[PDB]
A paper describes a structure:
1-Deoxy-d-xylulose 5-phosphate reductoisomerase from Plasmodium falciparum (PfDXR or PfIspC) is a homodimeric enzyme, with each subunit consisting of 488 amino acid residues. The enzyme DXR is also known as IspC, derived from the gene name ispC in the isoprenoid biosynthesis pathway. It is the enzyme responsible for the second step of a six-step catalytic reaction sequence catalyzing the conversion of the substrate 1-deoxy-d-xylulose 5-phosphate (DOXP) to 2-C-methyl-d-erythritol 4-phosphate (MEP) in the non-mevalonate pathway (MEP pathway). Accordingly, DXR, which belongs to the MEP pathway, a metabolic pathway not present in mammals, is regarded as a promising target for drug discovery. For the catalytic function of DXR, one molecule of NADPH and one divalent metal ion (either Mn2+ or Mg2+) are required per subunit as cofactors.
The N-phenylethyl group of MAMK150 adopted a curved conformation that did not fit into the subpocket. In the MAMK150 complex, the active site subpocket of PfDXR was occupied by five water molecules. Notable differences between the MAMK150 complex and the MAMK89 complex are that the MAMK150 complex exhibited a slightly more open loop structure, and the position of the side chain of Trp296 was completely different. In the case of the MAMK150 and MAMK251 complexes, the linker lengths are insufficiently long (ethyl) or excessively long (pentyl), respectively, and the phenyl moiety of the N-substituents is unable to utilize the subpocket. The reason for the significantly lower inhibitory activity of MAMK150 (64 nM) in comparison to those of MAMK89 (30 nM), MAMK218 (35 nM), and MAMK251 (29 nM) remains unclear based on the results of crystal structure analyses and computational analyses. With regard to the experimental observations, the side chain of Trp296 is in closer vdW contact with the side chains of Cys338 and Pro358 belonging to the active site core in the case of the MAMK150 complex when compared to the other complexes. This resulted in lower temperature factors and clearer electron densities for residues 291-299 being observed for the MAMK150–ternary and MAMK150–quaternary complexes. As an illustration, MAMK150 exhibits a markedly diminished capacity to inhibit PfDXR among the compounds under examination in this study. However, with regard to its capacity to inhibit the growth of P. falciparum, MAMK150 exhibits efficacy that is commensurate with that of MAMK89.
Numbering used by the authors:
A (entry chain B), B (entry chain A): 76 to 486
């Protein structure tokens, strides 16, 4: 009866929000069992979570703090968790019969491999790691085809919103990342809402001068550095366009980015009859996380009710692609298909980090990514699962090195 | 298999919008057969419709235009329809095996009676006559418990909006007008959007002297006189609050009226997790009517797509109960329960018509209704369906007489 959950990335933004809503839902009844907590290397933070939630499993990727973890946990009386490390620990958790649902709140390779193991073990995977979908979308679709009882449920707020706008009577007849998903759900088009980021109202002359300190400082909503920079360039939305494509089988010409600066409407679905359904709330990750764990039901929360009269005004406009060329790059990569999304994501990782570290300017971001995309030559897609995965990782590494080489030569 | 449809009140607003969307949808793919048309006495427009749609059945209320319809219909080549008359024609259409869905777009006794016959024959009934739900909701609920396979689908635009926000795998475990509909659908609260009407920004002193001409002239959206006056007083919205309560079993303290002057968001549903889902489009009756005929599926239309960036701004505010006291009266009658909603509806019918005819002032509308409500005493609710219907008719008639007497006494 309790939903048995593992959290990958339990000290990050998604992980901490997950545990916060789980704690609230478990006050009176045992709705969820927190069976496993995994982190990259935040050993002290994981220890503190273990004290509260007492999971059966604890895992740390970084083996150099494994011994520190085991020594910290000894101080917890009559608690005997299985303490694991590295990729073998990730696989053991994903394989456990005692786990039903896995929250993926970690990025990059750990996010990809944990998503893969969860699917291979026919789990429900609540995926907040958009980069895995963008970079490895065809690989995940292939895996989902083999492991027929696995399901990806989106946690990215916009994609959660879309998923919520659908009729569960039709959702239950397909699954995310399956061909024909949009046809079965009578989807015509998606409005993909965006905050627009901190630079939304700058002129082209002002935008030329922006620095990462301008994106990061005094933010309305405090988030990780990488995603803050992607929000400022709108590459975040560009990645979310490709994520939409893959999750919901929606054609690129039917995905429309809309800037909605109040961030109440989280996204909207237009059905084939031209009726539009939208999901709305305050900016929040707890509803998306909780819904991924309860779907297809909902459960009571004590979140503050939306007060629409107090919000009072909601606005919508189209983003300028001259100001936010990263959006255009993402559409171009998505439409080209093949491994261009892998290349996009990888080259962005480098450009984003160069800008974060004050090494390049705002329009150099899109210039580097564009040059790497132009340089990439299409490859035959491996039919075999493992070969395809290796192909993705090779192309990812190539794209990163190419971006770095471009920066090095114009430096 | 085609969808076989009957239209009651084919020459009215609901009726013509239904024929228009059916005609347009049919150009895309043949989904709908118009099997019966019924009108009150518009025999010339009925002839024109029968030429086009060639229904098996034609029926008119008024016997004294019966012969002329027979005669007009002779001119149509190859066409031998069953031509009927009055309440008996209505029963014959509703009991036909060749009819699956019935659109009720007529008011008053004819609306209540045709709804009743449609339910008694286990049909899907697409109901636009909100006054029958408000006045005779108890009777409808009882009938729907006796005829387990009958279903009412709402066509009133805000109620259609609500119904479209739901997951049909949950809706199919219940049906509208059933106790526990909101619990099964995990509904917490409803935002019932209003246009606010033509008097929305007037002062108390301006409202003291407004006339029916001020409500009716140069309307943003042209509708019948009665509903225009109801929109002006916001009694329309109060009736729609009671409608929401009956249709969806939502408590009155969980229904919030919000003035949304752009009329794009049609209403919103807050679930128990606090996630809010809304339906949006241009102001429109075609999507509500169409959804009632396709539910639980959707079909393709060639309606104009909503352009959110062009709409640009949506606004929301609370209505002033001091300016729109009819809203308060509707809540009070709803909360009191019993037959108070029947009394509200009947007395408003009189008060609306008095104001329309320049016999009373704006604040007299609420004053008359208030005084009628105050004079009513709660009645033992008959357990028997036939007695319950007679109680509703007698209370309706009493309430109209009472409103009339209050007018004549002060006058
Ligand atoms: O993709 C994102 C972050 C970037 C987008 C965003 C930024 C700011 C507000 C909302 C959305 P942007 O549209 O700028 O790319 N989210 O899904 C997280 C949304 C969220 C949730 C709780 C609190 C704050 C933010
Ligand atoms: O209840 C109503 C009419 C009164 C409400 C209304 C008035 C004006 C715009 C929208 C709604 P009000 O909120 O003033 O009571 N509808 O369901 C009709 C909606 C509609 C459809 C197509 C074209 C115009 C209007
Ligand atoms: Ca160490
Ligand atoms: Ca839904
Ligand atoms: Ca299309
Ligand atoms: Mn997002
Ligand atoms: Mn309405």
């Amino acid at each position: 009866k309790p939903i048995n959950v593992a959290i990958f990335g339990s000290t990050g933004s998604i992980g901490t929000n997950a545990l916060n809503i789980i704690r609230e839902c478990n006050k009176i009844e045992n709705v969820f069992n927190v069976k496993a907590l995994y982190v990259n290397k935040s050993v002290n933070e994981l220890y503190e979570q273990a004290r509260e939630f007492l999971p059966e499993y604890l895992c740390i990727h970084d083996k150099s703090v494994y011994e520190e973890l085991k020594e910290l946990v000894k101080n917890i009386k009559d608690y005997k968790p299985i303490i694991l490390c590295g990729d073998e620990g990730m696989k053991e958790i994903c394989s456990s019969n005692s786990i039903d649902k896995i929250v993926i709140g970690i990025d990059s390779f750990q996010g990809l491999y944990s998503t893969m193991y969860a699917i291979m073990n026919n789990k429900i995977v609540a995926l907040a790691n958009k980069e895995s979908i963008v970079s490895a979308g065809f690989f995940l679709k292939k895996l989902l085809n083999i492991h027929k009882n696995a399901k990806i449920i989106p946690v990215d707020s916009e994609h959660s919103a879309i998923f919520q706008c659908l009729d569960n009577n039709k959702v239950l007849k397909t699954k995310c990342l399956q061909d024909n998903f949009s046809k079965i759900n009578n989807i015509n088009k998606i409005f993909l809402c965006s905050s627009g980021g901190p630079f939304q109202n700058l002129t082209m002359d002002e935008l030329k001068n922006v620095t990462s300190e301008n994106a990061l400082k005094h933010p309305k909503w405090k988030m990780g550095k990488k995603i803050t920079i992607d929000s400022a360039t709108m590459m975040n939305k560009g990645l979310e366009v490709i994520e939409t494509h893959f999750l919901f089988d929606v054609d690129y010409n039917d995905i429309e980015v809309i800037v909605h600066k109040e961030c109440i409407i989280h996204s909207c679905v237009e059905f084939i009859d031209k009726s539009v359904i939208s999901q709305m709330y305050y900016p929040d990750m707890q509803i998306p996380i909780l819904y991924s764990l309860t779907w297809p039901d909902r459960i009571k929360t004590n979140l503050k009710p939306l007060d629409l009269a107090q919000v009072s005004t909601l606005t919508f406009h189209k983003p300028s692609l001259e100001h936010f060329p990263c959006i255009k790059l993402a559409y171009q990569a998505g439409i080209k298909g093949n491994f261009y999304p892998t290349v996009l994501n990888a080259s962005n990782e480098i450009a984003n980090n160069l800008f974060l570290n004050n090494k390049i300017k705002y329009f150099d971001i899109s210039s580097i990514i564009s040059q790497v995309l132009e340089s990439f030559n299409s490859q035959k897609v491996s039919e075999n699962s493992e070969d395809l995965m290796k192909q993705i990782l090779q192309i990812h590494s190539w794209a990163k090195d190419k971006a770095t080489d471009i920066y090095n030569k114009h430096n």
